[PDB]
């Protein structure tokens, strides 16, 4: 329950639970390229890259190469996102872009053929520019119905093949960097009222889509739907200091509790936020609280560099930033009453000059996975799957191509964009084969 995580602040295992669910993920803007090919409409990131920044993986034209990389790793699932403006170029559900539909349908067919489970993310930051220009995007509560219409079409066209759905990837960053820091599209700065209005509409849009899925599609399709929430971790500078511990709790509440309390908790924002942020935080009606709570069939958790870098991504409140994924999972278990957890994104990054010998990625993966195994076996945390991030090198948002996060290397100056397994691809392949660390 709300506040219980504060208690957390006061290689023993090789093999994961039998038939643990191993996977890997991408986002559409990071890997697809072909930003206006075949009638795809522009996203807010297409516009942002032109204004604020100065082909990528070409996944749109190299589907068979991505599939071969997935086969090499041997994953049981592949998380990817659908580019909304590739499917509906103006965001509204007028005539679908047939080549966009064909791409996602062919990808899903290829996964089903391989008995690889798709995990499909509806929104990974690429809002159709038409919705931003006409309404102000997520600032406008008209977005809730427009998003639900898009979700509805996706459930109808893809839900017989897709059994795991994610509405929104890391809504914290959508709101906070999109409208607070300006570091992400659409690049608005200050406007703290907009930050929390955007967060409010993301939560309400998510809830509407969960209720849509629960009522209209789950009975025949028998799948699961969640939302990927990201966080950092943090530790007190002075272990016995109750003020440092309180600030650690406030830090986690400010990033993760903001979105998880309404969806996974009691249906309302964290009480401390509702008071200090009273002039900017929208108020859930009593009817809305009942509709926000319980709108996630599992807890999807992101723990990666986007929640640590750059420095303005979150408030440390004078404490000590930590990469302790085991403790972060314990915080989730305590705050949100021991839910089933998918690690929907985990990994780190290298400088782009590191091509295939990504030794630090293996070091990070070993430590993260050991922490997950300890969380499962010592803390009884209900982690059922792990998404390595990312399948291949791509465009990394404001960092562009200056960092790499793929398990497969891509030479962006090569026309063929061959996916070359890095050291971490060989390592993760063996992890999956042995269901954990080598025996």
């Amino acid at each position, epitope marked *: 329950f709300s506040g219980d995580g504060r208690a957390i602040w006061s290689f023993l295992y090789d093999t994961f639970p039998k038939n643990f669910f191993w996977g890997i993920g991408t986002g559409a803007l990071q890997v697809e390229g072909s930003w206006k090919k075949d009638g795809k409409g522009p996203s807010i990131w297409d516009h942002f890259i032109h204004t604020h920044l100065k082909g990528s993986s070409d996944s749109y034209i190299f589907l068979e190469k991505d599939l071969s990389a997935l086969d090499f790793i041997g994953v049981s699932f592949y998380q990817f996102s659908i580019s909304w403006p590739r499917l509906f170029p103006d965001g*509204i*559900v*007028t*005539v*679908a872009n047939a080549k966009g539909l064909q791409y996602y349908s062919t990808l899903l067919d290829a996964l089903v053929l391989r008995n690889i489970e798709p995990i499909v993310t509806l929104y990974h930051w690429d809002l159709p520019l038409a919705l931003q220009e006409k309404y102000g995007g997520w600032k406008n509560d*008209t977005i809730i*119905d*427009i998003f*639900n*219409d898009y979700a*509805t*079409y996706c459930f*109808q*066209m893809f839900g017989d093949r897709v059994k795991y759905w994610i509405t929104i990837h890391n809504p914290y960053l959508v709101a906070w960097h999109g409208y607070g820091t300006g570091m992400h599209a659409p690049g608005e700065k200050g406007n703290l009222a907009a930050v929390y209005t955007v967060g409010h509409n993301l939560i309400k849009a998510h809830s*509407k889509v969960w209720h*849509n899925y629960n009522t*209209h599609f789950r009975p025949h399709q028998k799948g699961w739907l969640s939302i990927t929430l990201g966080s950092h971790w943090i530790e007190p500078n002075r272990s016995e200091n109750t003020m440092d511990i309180f600030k650690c709790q406030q830090s986690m509440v400010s990033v993760l509790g903001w979105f998880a309390n309404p969806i996974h908790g009691d249906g309302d924002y964290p009480e401390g936020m509702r008071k200090k942020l009273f002039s900017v935080l929208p108020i859930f009606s009593e009817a809305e609280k009942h509709e926000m709570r319980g709108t996630a069939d599992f807890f999807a958790f992101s723990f990666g560099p986007n929640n640590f870098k750059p420095l303005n991504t979150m408030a440390k409140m004078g404490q000590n930033v930590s990469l302790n994924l085991r403790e972060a999972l314990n915080w989730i278990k305590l705050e949100y009453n021991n839910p089933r957890i998918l690690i929907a994104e985990n990994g780190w990054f290298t400088d782009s000059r590191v091509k295939t010998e990504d030794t630090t990625a293996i070091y990070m993966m070993k430590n993260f996975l050991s922490q997950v195994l300890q969380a499962i076996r010592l803390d009884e945390i209900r982690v059922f799957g792990y998404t390595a991030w990312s399948l291949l090198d791509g465009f990394e948002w404001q960092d562009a191509y200056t960092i790499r996060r793929g398990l497969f290397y891509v030479d962006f100056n090569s026309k063929q964009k061959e996916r070359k397994p890095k050291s971490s691809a060989h390592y993760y392949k063996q992890i999956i084969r042995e269901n954990g660390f080598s025996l």
Partner: nanobody, 119 residues
Framework: QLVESGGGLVQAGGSLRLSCAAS?????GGWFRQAPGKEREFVAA????????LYADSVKGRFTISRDNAKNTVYLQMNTLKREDTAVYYC?????????????????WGQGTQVTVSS
């Protein structure tokens, strides 16, 4: 499964609201019409959640489509009616949440309701 209501006689410049009640999954609600001597033509349609409303050019800015899913009803508010709006109006439905203007893409149809606009 689809039941129109609200047709009838009205004077030129007047208003009429048509409604279409379903009997119960999501659907796009559509309206078509057929005038004497002419083929059935698209009028307006609305997505499941109401975010996408589409109108034939001949009625854009005069007709307004809306829906109340709690009542399983789609509404067509027809204002500034003209003589050439006289027709049998058919409501229609399409399951896939994609708002199209083509009659072959709607697989559920009503019986039709006469609307007559005088001068």
């Amino acid at each position: 499964q689809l039941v129109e209501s609200g047709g009838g006689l009205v004077q030129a410049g007047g208003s009429l609201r048509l409604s279409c009640a379903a009997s119960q999954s999501p659907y796009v609600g559509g309206w078509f019409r057929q005038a004497p001597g002419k083929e059935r033509e698209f009028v307006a349609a609305i997505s499941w959640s109401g975010g996408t409303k589409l109108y034939a050019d001949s009625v854009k800015g005069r007709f307004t489509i809306s829906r109340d899913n709690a009542k399983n009803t789609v509404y067509l508010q027809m204002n500034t009616l003209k003589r050439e709006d006289t027709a049998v109006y058919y409501c229609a439905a399409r399951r896939i949440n994609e708002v199209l203007t083509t009659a072959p893409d709607y697989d559920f149809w009503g019986q039709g309701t006469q609307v007559t606009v005088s001068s």
